[PDB]
From a paper:
Proline dehydrogenase (ProDH, EC 1.5.5.2) is a ubiquitous flavoenzyme involved in proline catabolism. It oxidises L-proline to Δ1-pyrroline-5-carboxylate (P5C), which is non-enzymatically hydrolysed to glutamic semialdehyde (GSA). ProDH adopts a distorted (βα)8 TIM-barrel fold. Next to methylenetetrahydrofolate reductase (MTHFR), ProDH is the only known TIM-barrel enzyme that contains an FAD cofactor.
We created a TtProDH variant (ΔABC), which lacks the N-terminal helices αA, αB and αC. ΔABC is poorly active but binds the flavin cofactor in stoichiometric amounts. From this variant, the MBP-tag could be successfully removed and the purified ProDH fragment was used for crystallisation. The three-dimensional model for TtProDH ΔABC comprises residues 38–279. Using ESI-MS, we detected that the C-terminal helix α8 of MBP-TtProDH ΔABC is unstable and becomes proteolytically cleaved in E. coli after Thr287. Deletion of the last 22 residues might increase the flexibility of the remaining C-terminal end of the protein and explain why residues 280–287 are not visible in the crystal structure. For the FAD cofactor, no electron density was observed for the adenosine 5′-monophosphate (AMP) moiety. This suggests that either the AMP part of the FAD shows multiple orientations and therefore is highly mobile, or that (part of) the bound cofactor is FMN instead of FAD. The mode of binding of the FMN-part of the flavin cofactor is strictly conserved compared to that of TtProDH. To confirm that ΔABC binds both FMN and FAD, the flavin content of TtProDH ΔABC was determined using fluorescence and mass spectroscopy for holo-EE. This revealed that TtProDH ΔABC contains 78 ± 5% FMN and 22 ± 5% FAD, similar as for holo-EE. The TtProDH variant ΔABC reveals that helices αA, αB, αC and α8 are not essential for binding of the flavin cofactor in TtProDH.
Author numbering: 38 to 279
The structure:
Amino acid sequence: IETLEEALKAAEALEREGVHAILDLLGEMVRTEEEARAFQRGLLELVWALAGKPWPKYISLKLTQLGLDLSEDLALALLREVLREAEPRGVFVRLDMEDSPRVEATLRLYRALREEGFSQVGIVLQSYLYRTEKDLLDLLPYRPNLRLVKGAYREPKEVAFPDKRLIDAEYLHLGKLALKEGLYVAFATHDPRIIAELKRYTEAMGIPRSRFEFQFLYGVRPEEQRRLAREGYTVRAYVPYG
Ligand SMILES: Cc1cc2nc3c(=O)[nH]c(=O)nc-3n(C[C@H](O)[C@H](O)[C@H](O)COP(=O)(O)O)c2cc1C
């Protein structure tokens, strides 16, 4: 998948099988505010093309591609402009969580936008960081729509659990904590141990299937994806393009 057209066909094919799509525009690495605005135009194109596609409309983005480090204010201003367009079309925008020095700014942006009244925006939290439980607790008043991941970056042992056993343990802790608090939670993991435990837990707790989902990368464990959709789970696959 390279182009938007190829990505939207991929979404079509998933939908035939009861699985949903998350569209993720990757661009060249944004080096300047002008590049952040060019990336923004690619996002506005994405929103436009998803508009009145009949199925659920979800995009994922990286805030560094809107110039987060160059200027948080500008990244916020450009994201706001995107959400003003996306909200009225029913397009949900997930803010992908990047590496640890960018976490505080990411949460400030999310909080700011929520406080302005946008509601079809979510966050990602990563179980490998020490800081994540407090971030989750701090965010409960906002009622976040939350995607839970383990974490994709090499991080130092002062900020992240060094042990994979601890990373996995924190994932289940945070997941259950979020669900017990009433948040919609997307579980973005391939780990069959964690998936089995979460299916067990939601059943035992009587958490309806409409309150959580599973997320997989496009093409990874595709049988499992179809199996979960057949059992009535909300399942999404993440489709990068660009
Ligand atoms: C659908 C989806 C979305 C993701 N979004 C993020 C993100 O925003 N930030 C991040 O660090 N990792 C993200 N990840 C990566 C996870 O951190 C993890 O590295 C990867 O899926 C492998 O771990 P797992 O299958 O054992 O849970 C995502 C993974 C999936 C499947």
